[PDB]
Amino acid sequence: MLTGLNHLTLAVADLPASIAFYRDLLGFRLEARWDQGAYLELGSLWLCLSREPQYGGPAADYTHYAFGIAAADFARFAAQLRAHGVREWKQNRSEGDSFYFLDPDGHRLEAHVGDLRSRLAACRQAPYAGMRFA
Amino acid sequence: MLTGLNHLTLAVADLPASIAFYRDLLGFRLEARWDQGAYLELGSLWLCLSREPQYGGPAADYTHYAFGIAAADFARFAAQLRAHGVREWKQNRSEGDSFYFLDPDGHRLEAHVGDLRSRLAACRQAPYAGMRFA
Ligand SMILES: C[C@@H]1O[C@@H]1P(=O)(O)O
Ligand SMILES: C[C@@H]1O[C@@H]1P(=O)(O)O
Ligand SMILES: C[C@@H]1O[C@@H]1P(=O)(O)O
Ligand SMILES: C[C@@H]1O[C@@H]1P(=O)(O)O
Ligand SMILES: [K+]
Ligand SMILES: [K+]
Ligand SMILES: [Mn+2]
Ligand SMILES: [Mn+2]
């Protein structure tokens, strides 16, 4: 069977800028760097940055990558990145604090308080349209 | 500060088709579905499918999502998805077996044997160009 998420790989046009963003601004640990990429870790997440100098960023769509944060740290994180001029791409509407921000290439990120279990519980108490649980 | 990956959200043009692909071909568990999305889980991975009917699939770039698989299971998985007519987008060149295939929208997926530690260990015996390690 498949076991989970093994790694997330992001195309990046400016590898140095993306390393700085994920490591220095977001707190990922840089584990390796080479002329065409970097490997970083956050908790159990393996992030690969693959250098693609002609990359123009993603299509405009809902695809996005959310990282967890503790409730007590949310407000400070959102304020830190806002003060650092990071661009937002969405305003939170769903259960649990969320800050929706763009990376240097325009990959859509989120910092979120909550998990699947808190989402399903909130949803059972107030179901989305047509919602069915399984 | 940030703790890891909280969830992966994919834009999907055809929500029923994507549910069946992730559940039935890739073995995710369907936890909830509503008119505009679904929540699934594989291991610790929270996958959200967000219905976006005019989505045309991603840009052609290196961005991709890899799921783990055990060495002994690899060949059967690759064979099964090929027999089912899944399209491939890349040929493996790096440490650990990998099968690189597209989802119904063209999101780039991978089934991979190994992890960050096995990659780092392999890279230290045979480093990529310019490679430096923490
Ligand atoms: C992605 C779908 O538009 C909705 P939401 O952002 O309000 O959940
Ligand atoms: C959890 C799923 O990504 C959606 P939301 O961030 O709009 O709640
Ligand atoms: C994504 C970069 O082209 C390289 P590789 O696929 O050989 O690692
Ligand atoms: C692990 C990083 O995604 C790259 P690869 O799949 O080309 O090895
Ligand atoms: K939210
Ligand atoms: K590989
Ligand atoms: Mn989200
Ligand atoms: Mn990969």
Swiss-Prot record, chains A, B:
One GO BP annotation of this record: response to antibiotic
Q: Where, by residue number, does Mn(2+) bind? A: 7, 64, 110
PROSITE patterns in the cross-refs: VOC (PS51819)
Task performed by this protein = Metalloglutathione transferase which confers resistance to fosfomycin by catalyzing the addition of glutathione to fosfomycin.
Localisation per UniProt entry: Cytoplasm
Task: Give the quaternary structure.
Answer: Homodimer.
Family, as annotated: Belongs to the fosfomycin resistance protein family.
Instruction: Kindly list the positions annotated as binding a divalent metal cation.
Output: 41
> Cross-referenced InterPro entries, in alphabetical order?
Glyas_Bleomycin-R_OHBP_Dase, Glyas_Fos-R_dOase_dom, GlyoxalaseI/FosfomycinResist, VOC
Q: What positions constitute the catalytic site? A: 110 (proton donor/acceptor)
Which co-factor is required?
A: Mn(2+)
Q: Which reaction does it catalyse?
A: RX + glutathione = an S-substituted glutathione + a halide anion + H(+)
Known regulation of its activity is: Requires the monovalent cation K(+) for optimal activity.
One of the record's GO cellular component terms? cytoplasm
Q: Which domain of life is it from?
A: Bacteria
Q: Name one GO molecular function term.
A: metal ion binding
Keyword annotations of the record: Antibiotic resistance, Cytoplasm, Manganese, Metal-binding, Potassium, Transferase, Zinc
Q: Which residues form the VOC domain?
A: 4-114
So what EC number does this one have? 2.5.1.18
**Protein name per its UniProtKB record:** Glutathione transferase FosA
